[PDB]
């Protein structure tokens, strides 16, 4: 019962990374629940355009922190081989709690 969470900024970077974990997992593991989105949390930013004073300007900025999950029940030492050190993405964070 290895709970795998994948939080990232680029949904392409996660999608792939979540695929990379999904592929070599059915190869040496057992029955996988697949990748699941959450939610996804955004951080809006309502700033004014001009540095001067024109309240009516304002540029909108966002920051989506996507969330992914891949569960793996019936954990074998074999499975933990392929998924030991076989990563590739750079703007992705993972945390496992089993």
């Amino acid at each position: 019962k290895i709970r795998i969470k994948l939080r990232g900024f680029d949904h392409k970077t996660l999608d792939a990374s979540a695929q990379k974990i999904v592929e070599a997992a059915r190869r040496s593991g057992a029955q996988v629940s697949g990748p699941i989105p959450l939610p996804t949390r955004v951080r809006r930013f309502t700033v004014i355009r001009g540095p001067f004073k024109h309240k009516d300007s304002r540029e909108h900025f966002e920051l989506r922190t996507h969330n992914r999950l891949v569960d793996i029940i019936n954990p074998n030492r074999k499975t933990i081989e392929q998924l030991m050190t076989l990563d590739l993405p750079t703007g992705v964070e993972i945390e496992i709690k089993t």
Binding site: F45, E59, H60, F61, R64
Partner: peptide, 8 residues
């Protein structure tokens, strides 16, 4: 500033 896009 990473992940900082333009809202829409």
């Amino acid at each position: 500033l990473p992940g900082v896009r333009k809202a829409s």
